[PDB]
Amino acid sequence: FPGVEPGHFGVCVDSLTSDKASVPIVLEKLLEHVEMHGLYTEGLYRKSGAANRTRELRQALQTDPAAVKLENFPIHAITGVLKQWLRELPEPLMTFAQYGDFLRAVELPEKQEQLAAIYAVLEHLPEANHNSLERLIFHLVKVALLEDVNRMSPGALAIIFAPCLLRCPDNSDPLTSMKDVLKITTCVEMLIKEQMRKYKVKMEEISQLE
């Protein structure tokens, strides 16, 4: 594809990272804006923005995501494009190959070994995928902390983001997709909750003088 830039939507996450940017610019740009302006918004990532404005925003972020003044766009169109960015990745952020590994983790009998197994799978994620997921989960932790205001629990966020992060391969048995959605949602919920739990713990250390 000579002379044309690949854009930022629909391209592999690794091609959007480098030595100067461990996280894709569009991902950071979107998440940081929501953190700086939108964490108080009721139904954040739940409500949907206008289709046209969301489309316009994706268009603008395609050519050059840096120059995009996100303040000129509605908050639910920004959250819409974010989820759309995740869904348009050539491979889901938590990969096709490790999809079954995540299922097997949550199929374990007890919570502790479930958590440990989940984090064991995270360690094997490709570098770009781990960097992006890391940034995203931290963002969702920030959102969930303001659940009393934005009404977005870790469970709600999990339901929204799990299918964006984990997709069963097209060559899987569609008779088991029934339980799989519950399983991938549980996986993401446990991840957000444990990261938030550790957040709250270290936060009580942060908030002291000496």
Side-chain angles (χ1 to χ4, degrees), residues 181-193:
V181 157
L182 279 176
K183 290 176 177 176
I184 61 177
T185 299
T186 294
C187 181
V188 175
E189 181 175 6
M190 292 183 65
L191 194 55
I192 298 176
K193 279 189 151 263

Side-chain angles (χ1 to χ4, degrees), residues 118-154:
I118 292 176
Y119 283 104
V121 186
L122 295 184
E123 288 291 87
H124 289 293
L125 286 172
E127 182 178 359
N129 305 67
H130 187 277
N131 295 0
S132 297
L133 183 68
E134 183 171 66
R135 183 62 178 86
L136 179 58
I137 295 299
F138 181 53
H139 175 80
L140 295 182
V141 166
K142 286 187 182 265
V143 175
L145 287 165
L146 294 183
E147 182 193 333
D148 292 346
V149 180
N150 58 38
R151 305 311 309 141
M152 301 311 297
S153 63

Side-chain angles (χ1 to χ4, degrees), residues 21-72:
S22 67
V23 179
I25 297 299
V26 194
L27 183 56
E28 173 63 33
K29 170 99 174 185
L30 288 170
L31 294 182
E32 194 268 354
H33 175 85
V34 173
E35 290 160 11
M36 288 287 140
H37 306 274
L39 295 185
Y40 291 156
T41 304
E42 302 175 4
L44 191 70
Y45 295 106
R46 162 118 102 110
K47 294 178 174 183
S48 55
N52 44 46
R53 193 57 169 165
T54 299
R55 178 192 60 233
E56 295 177 34
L57 179 61
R58 182 186 179 272
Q59 292 181 7
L61 291 177
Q62 274 287 73
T63 72
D64 178 31
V68 174
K69 301 183 180 61
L70 287 169
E71 87 245 16
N72 293 133

Side-chain angles (χ1 to χ4, degrees), residues 87-107:
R87 289 195 287 264
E88 288 189 9
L89 289 176
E91 178 175 56
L93 204 50
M94 294 167 69
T95 75
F96 277 145
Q98 300 180 244
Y99 175 86
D101 296 336
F102 285 111
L103 292 186
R104 269 19 100 186
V106 305
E107 288 168 3

Side-chain angles (χ1 to χ4, degrees), residues 194-208:
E194 172 74 355
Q195 289 296 119
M196 180 173 59
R197 183 194 65 81
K198 297 186 295 188
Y199 180 104
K200 287 208 181 76
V201 168
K202 288 134 190 171
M203 185 55 51
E204 278 295 275
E205 294 162 359
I206 275 181
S207 60
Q208 297 200 25

